[PDB]
Design an enzyme around this catalytic site. Structure first.
Site: not given
Lengths: 81, 108, 78, 386, 301, 283
Positions: B31, B34
């Site tokens: 991700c 993230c």
């Protein structure tokens, strides 16, 4: 300004006395305010724009204009010959 | 320093007691946001050196624990109070740092 | 001077335009004609008809019509 | 006031306006030129494992659609806090219509109060939902639904039981006013376990959808097809990109379904109608950085492209040529949106640190005086004999 | 599978530093081949970067026009031999490399000690001839750049030697389709196929800036965050937010009024204020009976 | 960082939009290539919508003028050629004009297919004096500027209209160069004039996307003896005399001809091919 000069000369009987009168008016500007002339504001250009405005038309002062897209100080616009 | 923990390490850390708020950062390697959240959290960890503890859990490893914590996506932060009566706060998405500072002070 | 000469040398005429004895696009305004030229739809010297919405100010030979087509309902084409 | 409705038709995107939020991520195969990747490995970032996210939230689809020249309105609820007001500002500047956005002074944007259990295994059991979960049926803007010709929503709006009933109410109202229902699955992380729970949860909304878009991974999961192809192998073998026959997706069909779109990123888009089916090849060799690696920008770009085509020629929903053109347009929109996001976000080197791709591809001088690439003094030379 | 295809129809290796490739792209709509051809040609000849030696440092040399005992060539001839050496690299930055040899023998390009990011294309390229067991150490600097430019070496970075394209009619005027051929000559630092892909990528990066948001669109990595920080600053020293950041979507206007204002590209509260009462009547469907109800909403605000 | 901005906008009328745009900072030589490509994309790669055929119903007697209409048939066609439209249509659709009688027929009176809109409602079509009914069927198409001839359907007395598809009326680019010492920097200006069916800013976006779509396909991947002459070979007279019949002198030319090619020439047999190969294997 080229068209403005031709406009002013249509109201003049003699173009040589027009040249002398403009120079006489320009000399008076420099004595009155010395430091404001010689760079972006030229006294002869100021006289011509003043005389167009005296007819009732509207022109920028001394025909002075600047580039708004200059990328900050130090940068000179370069001319493509 | 932000430390990586498993689900059993976090269970031992939540059931126990502490004097500072606990931030749990659910994340995954795949991700992109993230990774941006990791940068914010280490700036926050420096600001609150000992005033808080920041830990991260890999949801790919612990999908069972991520689901039981009601993580619906990534990034997801849990702000867990050291007061047992106080309730935790779950934030979703990339939230600005000032929100984290507000959560830590006002309600944690 | 050569550029203006080539620019204003018009269409080919007569036996230089048609192999055989004959026994063109219409444009609403000049901007449409120039736009068609930019899209390579016509050539610089290909003849065309231009709708003219000014007075008759075309320098031409002072000549009577080649042909008048006179419809029985009253309209005639010169 | 239908005499005041313009063109293109308005599209109502229903759900959540989150910031850089990803529902899930599944292993995926993309079309790639592996000869180039080996030649450019030291300069082009690639993930160790290619994992693709289906897309983002309803807000991002509204933003992407507005970027294509579409007319998008976002229907949802935001808090009156600073974060909620920043998101509302972001939607307005992106020219999304927010007259269908309810501002809640009592709820808080992007924050939920959970009651964490400290008795057995850890559980959460949300207590006070966030602002973007509290839209009520009384707060639905029926005027927007009257003007809108398409209603778009995703599964994230079905997760909360209170939010589910509002979504069902909005869908039913839109069907009454003759709106096309576009259901974008984008399966959230918890639903990927217990296929039976997923089927029960989405069954009612599934039968009310005229257009459905799923990923290839989502289609396999709903159809009970276990992935059998390889992942992260340096070839473009056709088994990685298989067009399923119509009978394989028939169990998901229903009476009112017009089109089913199956996405494999921008690599391949499959389409299924009652009469036609086909697939269009794309391109997924876009610049990707660690900040954009999940490819969620592509998914929003793809769906926005499909919506834009389907809404301007709504009578061509069954023309096979228009469907091929629509799929290719969606692929291009996804590629451009992914490409732009790499430029905006950049690379890792609110304290957030990023460098440009020019800086990412800049090597070290190798001018170390001990190193073997500089001029040492005459002492330690070892002039290599010719 | 795809309707529009491209392929290498000929790929030839004339020598180690002369590569030739010919490619076809068909079928194209009329005019597309001309657009692709000129843009591709300009990108190939002017936008592809290369890497080569930018300067050389000599150890015991007065000037670059002298001679060295034991070397057949002069110092000036050495620099010309260095200038013709073809290198390849994907990375940027000034690198340095080294020639540290003992004669007699033939110094070639394979005798250069290169940093790990840089590679030689042609081993056999001649640098110097040594007729005496002497010591010769030359430092080198290497850069990746576009166009063209211790002793400086006049670097010409461009790897594409020449390019050509032709356009041919596909056939009957169903849609007057066309066929495009592209010919590419490179110096071996990249293959013609790679040059074709790099020009396409470079062209896309030149046209995609117009698809970013216009300058000064968002208030000034994550464009949402600066406006949030402005709100935190406004909350302290209670100041309220200016009307340029308030949009008509957040006023409780009737939908007919809202559609009229948006149709006229009136988006914010400040845009609406600067409009007079005569201009709003000029808008269709917005009449005098609508001014009072709109003024009252702004009166109440 | 590279950014674009709109520096001038104006709307002289409903069918005259002007826009000036800036892109800076650019490296030397980049602005010319962008300006050339964008201008070509703006002038012929942007799809416009036009009326391409007109059909006068009610059997108006196929004359050059119609009773009750001030304007001739040709002038109506010229007026219809000037009507500016925008649309999203795929393929071709029909529109219709059905006017009862006296008054002004304008673009306002065109009944439009779904995605089609009219830019200037006051554009003139015909002046009707008598209370006659006029019924004109129209053909509406969306095409590129550099595009082509739509295959003829020539019957039923439908007059073709030679439409020029150019929503962008004009486009120009200029480059400014700045410098402070050795550091150069150029700025690209792009001017766009549209006929109102599209804003200049929207034309800039479509031109960029159309250019990008033209170059994406290149990134697509797919699923997975001279100095030995015939005379020096001891060949039979029949074989040798036949080899010279085809202007073959050196053994390179002999080996440059296929076995199928060698048979096609007069007076060459199958046994002759074998004898040549037998001798060839011997050297």
């Amino acid at each position: 300004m080229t068209m403005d000069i031709e406009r002013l000369l249509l109201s003049e009987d003699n173009r040589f006395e027009f040249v002398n009168s403009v120079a006489a008016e320009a000399t008076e500007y420099v004595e009155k305010n010395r430091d404001e002339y010689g760079g972006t504001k030229k006294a002869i250009f100021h006289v011509l724009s003043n005389r167009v405005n005296d007819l009732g038309f509207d022109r920028p002062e001394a025909y002075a204009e600047s580039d708004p897209y200059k990328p900050g100080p130090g940068y000179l616009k370069e001319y493509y010959t | 320093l932000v430390r990586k923990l498993s689900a059993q390490e976090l269970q031992d850390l939540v059931k126990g007691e502490r004097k500072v708020p606990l931030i749990v950062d659910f994340y995954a390697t795949w991700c992109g946001p993230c990774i941006l959240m990791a940068q914010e959290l280490e700036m926050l960890a420096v600001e609150y050196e000992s005033n808080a503890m920041i830990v991260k859990v890999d949801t790919d490893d612990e999908y069972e624990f991520a689901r039981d914590m009601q993580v619906r996506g990534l990034p997801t932060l849990f702000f867990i109070s050291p007061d047992p009566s106080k309730d935790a706060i779950r934030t979703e998405g990339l939230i600005p740092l000032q929100m984290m500072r507000d959560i830590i002070d006002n309600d944690m | 001077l050569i550029g203006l000469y080539v620019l204003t040398s018009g269409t080919r005429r007569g036996i230089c335009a048609n192999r055989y004895n004959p026994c063109e696009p219409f444009f609403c305004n000049s901007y449409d004609a120039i736009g068609a030229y930019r899209q390579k739809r016509i050539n610089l010297d290909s003849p065309l008809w231009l709708r003219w919405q000014l007075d008759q100010r075309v320098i031409a030979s002072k000549e009577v019509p080649i042909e008048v087509h006179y419809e029985s309902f009253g309209n005639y084409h010169e | 006031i239908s005499h005041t409705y313009g063109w293109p038709p308005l599209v109502c995107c229903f759900g959540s306006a989150q910031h850089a939020f990803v529902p899930s991520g599944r292993p995926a195969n993309r079309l790639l030129d592996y000869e180039r990747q080996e030649r450019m490995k030291d300069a082009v970032w690639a993930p160790e494992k290619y994992i693709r996210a289906p897309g983002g939230c309803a807000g991002g689809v509204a933003i992407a659609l507005a970027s294509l020249g579409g007319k998008a309105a976002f229907m949802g609820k935001l808090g009156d806090d600073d974060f909620g007001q920043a998101m509302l500002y972001y939607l307005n500047v992106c020219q999304v219509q927010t007259r269908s956005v309810k501002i809640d002074s009592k709820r808080v944007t992007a924050c939920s109060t959970m009651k964490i259990s400290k008795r057995g295994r850890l559980k959460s059991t949300c207590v006070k939902p966030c602002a973007e979960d509290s839209l009520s049926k009384s707060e639905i803007n029926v005027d927007v639904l009257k003007e809108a010709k398409m209603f778009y929503f995703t599964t994230h709006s079905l997760l909360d039981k209170k939010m589910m009933s509002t979504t069902l109410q909005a869908i039913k109202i839109s069907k009454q006013l003759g709106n096309v229902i576009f259901y974008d699955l984008n399966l959230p992380l918890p639903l990927w376990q217990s296929l039976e729970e997923t089927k029960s949860l989405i069954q009612e909304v599934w039968d009310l959808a005229d257009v459905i878009e799923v990923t290839k991974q989502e289609l396999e999961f709903l159809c009970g097809i276990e992935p059998t192809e390889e992942f992260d192998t340096k070839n473009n073998d056709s088994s990685k990109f298989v067009h399923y026959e119509p009978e394989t997706v028939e169990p998901l069909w229903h009476e009112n379904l017009k089109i089913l779109f199956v996405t494999n990123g921008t690599s391949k888009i499959h389409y299924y109608t009652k009469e036609h089916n086909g697939a269009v090849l794309g391109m997924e060799d876009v610049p990707i950085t660690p900040f954009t690696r999940d490819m969620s920008a592509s998914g929003d770009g793809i769906v926005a492209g499909l919506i834009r085509m389907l809404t301007v020629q709504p009578d061509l929903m069954n023309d096979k040529g228009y469907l091929e053109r629509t799929a290719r347009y969606a692929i291009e929109c996804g590629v451009v949106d992914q490409w732009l996001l790499a430029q905006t976000r950049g690379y890792p080197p609110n304290g957030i640190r990023s460098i440009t791709e020019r800086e990412y591809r800049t090597s070290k001088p190798y001018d170390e005086p001990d190193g073997p690439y500089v001029m040492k003094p005459v002492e330690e030379r070892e002039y290599r004999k010719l | 599978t795809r309707t529009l295809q491209w392929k290498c129809v000929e790929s030839r290796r004339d020598s180690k530093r002369l590569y030739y490739g010919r490619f076809i792209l068909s079928p194209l709509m009329k005019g597309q081949a001309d657009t692709i051809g000129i843009a591709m040609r300009r990108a190939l000849l002017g936008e592809i970067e290369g890497t080569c030696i930018t300067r050389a440092k000599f150890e015991n040399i007065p000037h670059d026009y002298s001679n060295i005992v034991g070397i057949q060539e002069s110092v000036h001839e050495i620099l010309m031999n260095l200038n013709e050496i073809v290198l390849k690299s994907n990375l940027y930055g000034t690198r340095n490399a080294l020639i540290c040899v003992q004669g007699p023998g033939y110094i070639t390009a394979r005798d250069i000690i290169l940093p790990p990011s840089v590679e030689i294309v042609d081993n056999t390229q001649h640098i110097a001839t040594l007729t005496e067991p002497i010591n010769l150490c030359i430092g080198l600097k290497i850069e990746r750049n576009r166009g063209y430019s211790s002793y400086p070496i006049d670097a010409v970075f461009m790897p594409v030697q020449n390019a050509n394209h032709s356009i041919h009619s596909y056939g009957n005027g169903n849609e007057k389709q066309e066929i495009l051929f592209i010919e590419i000559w490179t110096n071996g630092s990249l293959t013609p196929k790679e040059a074709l892909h790099e020009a396409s990528r470079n062209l896309i990066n030149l046209f995609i800036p117009f698809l970013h948001v216009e300058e000064e669109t968002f208030y000034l990595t994550l464009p949402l965050f600066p406006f949030h920080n402005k709100l935190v600053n406004l909350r302290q020293k209670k100041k309220e937010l200016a009307f340029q950041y308030i949009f008509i979507d957040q006023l409780e206007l009737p939908p007919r009024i809202y559609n009229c204002l948006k149709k006229s590209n009136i988006h914010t509260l400040l845009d609406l204020l600067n409009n007079s009462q005569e201009d709003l009547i000029k808008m269709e469907h917005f009449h005098i009976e609508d001014v009072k109800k709109l003024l009252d909403i702004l009166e109440k605000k």
